[PDB]
Design a protein around this ligand. Structure first.
Ligand SMILES: Nc1ncnc2c1ncn2[C@H]1CC[C@@H](C(=O)Nc2ccc(S(=O)(=O)C(F)(F)F)cc2)CC1
Length: 351
């Protein structure tokens, strides 16, 4: 970072954080980039090793700059999740960004989502997240409201470059407005409890906590709640299952691989929900084998139907990003991949 912003960040840390941060000079302030870009930039700020801690205060903190009533809701949500220890602590909030607890950890990779212990804990963390009471609108308008929003943007897109017109053209040929109504119809007739959903539960949004790699059941934290809202539970689980097929670490264009064969098997899904249901309804454990098994089979139909909305939603989303995003990513190919998966899943389900 340039000297002007380095100023900004020094002051935030000095003005907002307790103990040693308070009596610290500009010439003892360490900050380096974690993630650059023009939106949601991340930086680690730290004390010198030479400087002694006074009280509770942390040695490292993460600074997050927004870059680019939405802010009120996200801030409140983040504060609340920090109070309940479900997210990183919140140390500072200001117009340009926030200071949060730095969680020593790494992101999971796509392959890890299928490891039984990992999958089981995600299901447990997700169930916990789904139990949160939040001061937000409890009507499930997010999913279809967001899909309509992006669809309407998609119909207005026009591309200057030539290959992009052809790609958009193939996508528009599916009759997106009509297909959206097909989806709504299917989902309106699929019962799914409304709950506080993460809405974006992918490997890059799950941290594996340092020094807990040997723990069986408490080694992960869910992060990045920008899309979170009251939603059908089926979406969050179906969305997460879709995320087994996609790997965003791929180092060449289009900067992702899709592997349709990596969608969880019946067995792997059952592994996930068998960890989910006990964690979401505490007395589920005490049902009869028969009653448990009826609930589980029903739940598989549910999440596999909702997985269609994941394909449809991120497909549309991805067309819009191709237009407006600064990030280096093959959006249009990703959109085609999500729609291919959408039509494949309808075939699999017989819808
Ligand atoms: N509160 C949080 N919210 C979202 N993500 C978080 C949070 N806390 C941690 N993380 C991820 C953890 C894993 C990962 C990470 O640590 N990356 C990273 C860390 C440090 C550097 S560096 O400063 O250049 C270094 F090399 F160390 F010197 C560069 C990159 C990304 C950040």
């Amino acid at each position: 970072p340039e000297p002007r912003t380095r100023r900004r960040a020094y002051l935030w840390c000095k003005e907002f954080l307790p103990g040693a941060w308070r009596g610290l000079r500009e010439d003892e302030f360490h900050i380096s980039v974690i993630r650059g870009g023009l939106s949601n930039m991340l930086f680690q700020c730290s004390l010198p090793d030479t400087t002694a801690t006074l009280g509770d205060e942390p040695r490292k903190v993460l600074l997050r700059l927004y870059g680019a009533e939405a802010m009120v809701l996200e801030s409140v949500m983040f504060a609340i999740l920090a109070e309940r220890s479900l997210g990183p602590k919140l140390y500072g909030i200001f117009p340009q960004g926030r200071l949060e607890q730095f969680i020593p950890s790494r992101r999971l990779d796509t392959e890890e989502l299928s490891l039984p212990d990992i999958s089981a804990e995600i299901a447990e963390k997700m169930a916990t997240f789904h139990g949160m009471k939040m001061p937000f609108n409890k009507e499930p308008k997010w999913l279809f409201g967001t899909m309509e929003k992006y669809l309407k943007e998609v119909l207005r897109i026009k591309f200057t470059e030539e290959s992009r017109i052809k790609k958009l053209h193939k996508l528009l040929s599916y009759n997106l407005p009509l297909e959206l109504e097909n989806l709504r119809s299917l989902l309106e007739s699929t019962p799914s409890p409304v709950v506080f959903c993460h809405n974006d539960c992918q490997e890059g949004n799950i941290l594996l906590l340092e020094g807990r790699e040997n723990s069986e059941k408490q080694k992960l934290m869910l992060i990045d709640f920008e899309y979170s809202s009251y939603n059908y539970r089926g979406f969050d689980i179906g969305n997460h299952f879709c995320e087994w097929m996609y790997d965003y670490s791929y180092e060449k264009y289009p900067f992702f691989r899709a592997n349709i064969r990596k969608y969880p098997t019946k067995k792997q899904q059952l592994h996930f929900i068998s960890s989910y249901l006990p964690a979401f309804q505490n007395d589920f454990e005490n049902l009869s084998t028969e009653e448990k098994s009826i609930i589980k089979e029903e739940m598989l139909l549910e999440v596999n139907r909702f997985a269609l909305a994941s394909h449809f939603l991120w497909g549309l989303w991805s067309i819009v990003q191709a237009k407006i995003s600064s990030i280096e990513f093959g959006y249009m190919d990703y959109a085609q991949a999500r729609f291919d998966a959408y039509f494949h899943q309808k075939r699999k389900l017989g819808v």
